[PDB]
Amino acid sequence: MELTPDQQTLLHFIMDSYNKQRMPQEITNKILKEAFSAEENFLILTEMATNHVQVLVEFTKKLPGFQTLDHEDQIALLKGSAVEAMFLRSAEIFNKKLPSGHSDLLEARIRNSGISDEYITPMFSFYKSIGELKMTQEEYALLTAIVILSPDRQYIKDREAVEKLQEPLLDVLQKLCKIHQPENPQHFACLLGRLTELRTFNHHHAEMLMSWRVNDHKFTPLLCEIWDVQ
């Protein structure tokens, strides 16, 4: 029922690693302060996305057993999850409680940031569906670790090795879902279902960058590797 001492140790370790990220307040304060051009927002995006990948690699390296994995599988896991992890973190940031009217202004600013119309609606639909779950910080951290340690990622040679590392994280998350939401026995299943919805963002992530309403689409060499853009 309750977390065991080993699970409590695992949870605080994942939380400490997860907390090394930029505070949501920092990101939203920047976007709410003043409106920027599509060109200025494109550069803000590439800076933030580059920093997110760097922080994600350090978080991933700290995941128990990750560094014991086959090196090619390590690359396949990071490359397969980087985009999904960024959208999950964007959903967390979007659903953080702000003063009256601020979340509406934040949504309006992102809606007019330069991103194409085709990608706007699905993005906010995902953020609002994530928001309805009313996830705790621990749920976001564990869910991010579960996304990274996905054994059914493309090019993974040894699935079982990845399964073994993901399994205890799923066990902790399931227990937390039962504790934080005993009224909703579907909470855990819903979280896992949202991970399938996250995967549809990989299908058009490169296009979301390429279709940004700017004249030139300059990317950092690290972003080119992770987002499949030139």
Binding site: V57, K61, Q74, I75, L78, E225
Partner: peptide
């Protein structure tokens, strides 16, 4: 060929 990702993974 994920040269930078490889470097970030293999450093330290």
């Amino acid at each position: 060929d994920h040269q930078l990702l490889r470097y970030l993974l293999d450093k330290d």
